[PDB]
Amino acid sequence: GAQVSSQKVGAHENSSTINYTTINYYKDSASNAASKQDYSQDPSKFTEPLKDVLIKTAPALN
Amino acid sequence: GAQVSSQKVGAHENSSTINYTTINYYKDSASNAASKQDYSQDPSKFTEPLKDVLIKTAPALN
Amino acid sequence: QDSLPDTKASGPAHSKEVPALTAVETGATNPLAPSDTVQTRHVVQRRSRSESTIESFFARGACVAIIEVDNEQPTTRAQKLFAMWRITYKDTVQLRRKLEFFTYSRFDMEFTFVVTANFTNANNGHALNQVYQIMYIPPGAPTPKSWDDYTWQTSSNPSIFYTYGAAPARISVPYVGLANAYSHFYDGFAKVPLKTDANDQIGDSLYSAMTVDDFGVLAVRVVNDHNPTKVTSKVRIYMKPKHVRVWCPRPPRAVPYYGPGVDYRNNLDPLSEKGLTTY
Amino acid sequence: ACGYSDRVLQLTLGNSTITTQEAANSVVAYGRWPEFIRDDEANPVDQPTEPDVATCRFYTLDTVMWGKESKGWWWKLPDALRDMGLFGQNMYYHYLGRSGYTVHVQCNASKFHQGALGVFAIPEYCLAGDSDKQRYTSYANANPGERGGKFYSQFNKDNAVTSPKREFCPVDYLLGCGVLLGNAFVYPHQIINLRTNNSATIVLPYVNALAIDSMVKHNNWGIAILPLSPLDFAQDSSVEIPITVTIAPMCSEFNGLRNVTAPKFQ
Amino acid sequence: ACGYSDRVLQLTLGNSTITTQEAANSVVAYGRWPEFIRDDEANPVDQPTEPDVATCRFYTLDTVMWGKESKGWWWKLPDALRDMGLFGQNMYYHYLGRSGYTVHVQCNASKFHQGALGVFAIPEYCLAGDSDKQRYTSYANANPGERGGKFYSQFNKDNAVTSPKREFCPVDYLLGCGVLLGNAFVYPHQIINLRTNNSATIVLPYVNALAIDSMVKHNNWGIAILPLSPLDFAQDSSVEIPITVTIAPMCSEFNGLRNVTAPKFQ
Amino acid sequence: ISEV
Amino acid sequence: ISEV
Amino acid sequence: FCGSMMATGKILVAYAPPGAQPPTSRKEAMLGTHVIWDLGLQSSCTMVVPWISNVTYRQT
Ligand SMILES: CCCCCCCCCCCCC/C=C/[C@@H](O)[C@H](N)CO
Ligand SMILES: *C(=O)CCCCCCCCCCCCC
Ligand SMILES: *C(=O)CCCCCCCCCCCCC
């Protein structure tokens, strides 16, 4: 049940993919730590919530 | 001897089947934790303990 | 792979494509990049937004309560042999303000408890190490009337027994909301006055409040019987949201909080003075 | 070639049509068009009523006048429509109700007038009260119906601690709720800037932490219209022009039928 | 074997269920179950509202008492339901409305009581007036709502030719309209004969010479309940037992929405 | 180990 | 185990 | 019903989802969920109060 993932390495020693290991010890998922491997999204629903979305090179009002 | 099972996840992080691991460390089963993976049953032995069980759309007294 | 987009090289323009002009009346933000209005070079971008994900913005224990509880001889007056705190993030301001960038949220909650004690009197002997019971009392369960009445038997409510000097206690709680998300803002009432009501009190309720007891209370006591010298303790509670999702962004609080609603009262002047043409 | 423009639109719902020849495109809040509760998101088990064209049609509220000293107007939904035809009847006969909305704000002037209105649609628009007592605005005062309310330039605390008014005191640059008005642009919005357009159209999905709720107890959306730039004309000091708000319920469904709710407003 | 009987029925419509354990089967008038207007029989072109469960449910009218001197009762449809929940609201907000109905008449007594009620459903039940003036019953008097009207044993002509009552004078053996009561059996009907049954159930299709009409101006069906054999019990001379009428709209659709009709009844 |  |  | 076999009657039992005036008359009660019970050989009648709620769980 060990999950092995890659670390995003910042400073490098003068010594490659370094991995880390996680095992969940509890049945309830609320006990789990955060994996912090989080995806993102498009801001459009806030920055461009327009019915006809127009291209930035074209006039906004036609 | 590790048992790996799925957690039923409630809140989800913005990151799937998350598993947890269990190993029993003692010979006596009284030492074990509870697995809480418990099955249920039919209440009929209490709600309908009738010798002729009739269908709910039919008259109870025929 | 999580880096931000690369800057593209771009050169001069003389054309009918005009990205610099727009109409903000439409409700949209103009998605320009520097290469739309200046000549840029190519830059391989390596920066990322790893630390401003919703999980990383909230991934800190924030203090939400300081509960004081004493261990001394039970006298007949009002004492603090046990204390109760109604669970909330609105008694402090810092975590409240970060959650209120959003209207709704869904998360699990980690609570860590830091406990400190001190003597109050110069000396009436000493005290042996104290054990603390923190019992969660959900809405509807009986609340203690004295520090050792039957409710502390805790047969069904969860309790933590913490030993002084041990590492801070810590537990996690699932998403326990009655709705599909927690509401940080509720524009409504729990009751409506009807025309046929006998009097006006019947349908009156507080604006923007939902249930009365919300999440219940934490009841804290020292389990030890009293020593001859009095010992005062404080339990500080730190909340950390984990496995966080949030919906509908809001302007952040700009003037001091005045209660659990959105009311304001003083210091309604957040901006300072600066000349229009002063750098 | 044949001539379609994002400035000219026709909206038709039920038996009502709106035309505008000076729009600035239209906003669909949070990119979500309204929809009915799906079976896998359903919670009350009784069969819902869906009045469809009888309630999902444009209702025009009473016109308000924009003058040089106007500070702004606000309405809450579904409250502003509580007395509108069969939408109000279905709202009060049922414990639960759900609805999205098309909001169309109308304000024409001329090529020699100037001014800009900010039209913001805010989920859970909690407003601040008028006194030292917290969360004390009463139900009848929090819910003005189609009349809506107004903003003020400053906090005037109700002092008659004897017969408190129990009203909101929405200060305009604080958006009536303790945040700065300039950041209200994170909410779905349009601007009616008189040199550019004469209307704003915003489509609102149902937003709540529940699939359906009590419409009588809870307002889902607030509409706030504030003069971002004040009205002005020629060199006259008392120009006034109308602002008319027309709103249509969309994908209305109701659950929990019984006798009618009759709130006490007066 | 498991036990189904044409004496025991359950009717469920919307959020309402009726049970009876002493029915005498049920009548579907003219063999036609209610239905919506088909496209090839359609006439108004606007999209109809079909409130479905909000209006097609059982409404119970006020109980009337059957005593030894009762001559009979009559109601008209849709009039008896004009003030019933959202059926009445849809009826008055729309120019046109169409509906079929399930009528369930309830009257229990005991094995020692006797009497028989005739329950008749009559299309276009025109009733006769009280005076020398022809066709003079007024709108408010022709339409009693859920209260219904009564029959008489004889023609009592209104004589105050000054302030005429303008009421119906329905004589019972003439079915209130100049024909003999004994021939009313050509209309869809059941009999509640107390030794046999305690209820009558009749399903009524919409019947009219048009696919849809004004519900406010025109009643499609009349319900007439007359004692075919008078109530009697033990040897008492003043026995009374209740008669309760419960009616449910079926396949309701409405066209022509506008502001609400408010008839003048008083 | 034994996943279940 | 499960590498990701 | 625990009356004698010779007793007859019809009873309306109703459920009004919250938010309006609590029913004081049959006329108001019959506009909500209801069952009309006819007394007879089947001695008992069941009314089901359907889950009709805004929140996904109510408080006890
Ligand atoms: C032994 C100690 C157990 C402690 C158990 C605590 C249970 C309650 C956890 C509540 C987390 C609350 C977060 C806030 C939610 C609110 O925003 C909203 N009012 C809900 O609609
Ligand atoms: C997946 O889990 C495969 C086996 C991993 C073996 C190492 C387990 C370490 C101990 C976990 C104990 C959890 C609590 C009983
Ligand atoms: C199944 O058990 C396969 C092997 C699991 C390896 C991890 C064991 C961790 C230590 C268990 C010690 C128990 C007490 C001696």
Swiss-Prot record, chains D, E:
Disulfide bonds: none
Places the protein is found: Virion; Host cytoplasm
Subunit structure: Interacts with capsid protein VP1 and capsid protein VP3 in the mature capsid.
Protein's job: Forms an icosahedral capsid of pseudo T=3 symmetry with capsid proteins VP2 and VP3. The capsid is 300 Angstroms in diameter, composed of 60 copies of each capsid protein and enclosing the viral positive strand RNA genome.
The name this protein goes by in its record: Capsid protein VP2
Organism: Poliovirus type 3 (strains P3/Leon/37 and P3/Leon 12A[1]B)
Lineage per the UniProt record: Viruses, Riboviria, Orthornavirae, Pisuviricota, Pisoniviricetes
